[PDB]
Design a binder for this molecule. Sequence first.
Ligand SMILES: [Fe+3]
Length: 820
Amino acid sequence: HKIKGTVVLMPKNELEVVDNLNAFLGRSVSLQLISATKADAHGKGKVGKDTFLEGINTSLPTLGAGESAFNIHFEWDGSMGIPGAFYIKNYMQVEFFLKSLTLEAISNQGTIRFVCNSWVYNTKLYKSVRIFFANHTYVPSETPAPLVEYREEELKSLRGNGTGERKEYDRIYDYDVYNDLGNPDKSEKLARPVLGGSSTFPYPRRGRTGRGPTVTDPNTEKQGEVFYVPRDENLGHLKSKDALEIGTKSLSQIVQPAFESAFDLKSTPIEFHSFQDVHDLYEGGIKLPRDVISTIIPLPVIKELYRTDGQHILKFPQPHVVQVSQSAWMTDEEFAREMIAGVNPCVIRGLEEFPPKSNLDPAIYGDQSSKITADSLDLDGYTMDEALGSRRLFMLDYHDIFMPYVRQINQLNSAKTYATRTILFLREDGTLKPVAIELSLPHVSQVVLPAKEGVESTIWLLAKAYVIVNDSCYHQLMSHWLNTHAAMEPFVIATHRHLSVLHPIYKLLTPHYRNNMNINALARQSLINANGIIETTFLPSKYSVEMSSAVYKNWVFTDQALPADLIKRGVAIKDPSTPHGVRLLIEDYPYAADGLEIWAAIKTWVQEYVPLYYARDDDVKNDSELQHWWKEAVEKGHGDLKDKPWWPKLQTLEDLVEVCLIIIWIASALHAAVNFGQYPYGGLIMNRPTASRRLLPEKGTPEYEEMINNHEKAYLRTITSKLPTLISLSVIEILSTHASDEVYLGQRDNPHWTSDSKALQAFQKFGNKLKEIEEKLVRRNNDPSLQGNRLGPVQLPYTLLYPSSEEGLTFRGIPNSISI
Ligand SMILES: [Fe+3]
């Protein structure tokens, strides 16, 4: 009596950026089945004999690209029971990627499926044998008794002991602080503060790498050529062009030096002179020396970012925001519209008092009452009283965020900034109108009003640029990096440390983690590190990541839920008569209106999945894996905030739903909404300037005269210089691209991720609901009454929360995870 099995795997070279299939035969790969129902004398499931792959199975039609299938037969007599797990031992010298095992039975119901999706190195490298479980879901108390120890031992394998340098083939999840970003052993000027583990610099934890201390600072971790992630977080890709995450490394270590050399050799003018010089980047391109182009175009990923003639030309793609109107970005209407439908749509707040007030210490900064007067504003005939009472006043407030850093920034050689406020008025036609900008300095502090003619219209244009320099920095460092990438990683770590792969909540959440540790590790190495891409292109330079620590002090997990966010920002009110429980004070608000549809669908899914496994509130309390998971995520992963009173306790069904819903929301729709618009809106540097280099010119200076005679040059002298523009355009093009192997909301990588047909059916309903939401959002973008805020003068429909997308730079599609 034998059991027929099929093993599907991919050899190593299919997923890299030579293999031989017959080498897998012979005695080179062993599997041993493990009983779920018959135990040995110590209560452990009985283990069968070593069994080797017999032959190649080419007669299998369900195979995907790069996959190979092998037949196997298992001798399994009547003493052995029913198999529920297996061990595998790879005796080859090379690792392979194990997809699945499927055992055949007389009936289709008796098929047993194992979904593995795991790299398997040579067995001498591992401390304990690699084990895999069948696809049945179990809360711990429901685990078959012969599998209990194994389930617990594998969780111990994933946690390690807190020590040691991590090597490529390790699968060990643990926490550390952000002490790996500085490079003091290269130069003292590259020292950076440790972020995390203090009340001065609180921060989420990141994945532990264990490379040990620098020579000059025992607090900082020494450099490495590879920044470890647990092996099965280091994703391979069938197509080299899909390894976008690796492009950030190539950009920093190969492309940026090549660009810098072109500027050092005066082979191209160092500054833009006119707005046409910027538009040229996507029309005729920029001309560079042949050795720079020959440095750039052989590189995977990087070569996809540009068109070239192979000799002198690099062209950038035309950004969405200039596809219909080259100039509409300059309009006040677009400036305000992008606050509710642009790259960073989640900062604007309602104003219930006037004037707005500061929360900083007057002993250090001064009177910080706004200098905006009520009677200087044109509110289309409303008094201030009426506008406040009707909730038609809003603001973009960067005053208290930036004021503590402006002095230090303004002492950097390549930066000058204001701390800004923007007052907006909601017209009767439903669009926002900017009515005043306040530009403040600590320790002059000016109010600028709109103006279409004269030198004052140029001053207004520059005031908008300083606002958007604030907003670009806040978007990249806080809305994007802190609130999604950095805040999510500790939950990834805790999940693998404490929820068995068997666990229903592991299965629910882990699709929403795909590639997140991997892109984050590459970002610590090349994006957010000292002298990295963010420091050399965004305003705060060496203060960039530490500013995000100051903002994390006020981060609140439960305020990341979309309805809570909208209430807290005063852009909606609670209203149980509405379908979503909130009424939007800006009715057409596209990010919020579309987001509420997606939020509701995810909520329905979580609410239909959890009660499959947790019938009563007690069942949540009694799940030891779930309780250890949430205790560790809060008290280690976000441990600098562990004292705060707003953390859910996780003692009820409602808590479990809330926590799962918020995590899925951050990782999918929130990240998509702030990420995939970066090149579409920001690929024109004038529209989203990353830095400012001077303050407003004083009257009677040649800089003031220039401002009168050549507004374009005055604008370009103020914002990001040409060389950092090239670098930042390249990085946000990468970050805005969907890889062809992306897994979107409503999709999963394997359709047999669980054997529970009820869960499978609830998941199908979720995917159907998303397709109907997409149709609803299409209709909104076609509704002429919503054109003012959904399309605007740039005539660009808001598609960033359409759930589906094709590959590429599409301005749509919601991935499952923080994948790029
Ligand atoms: Fe991202």
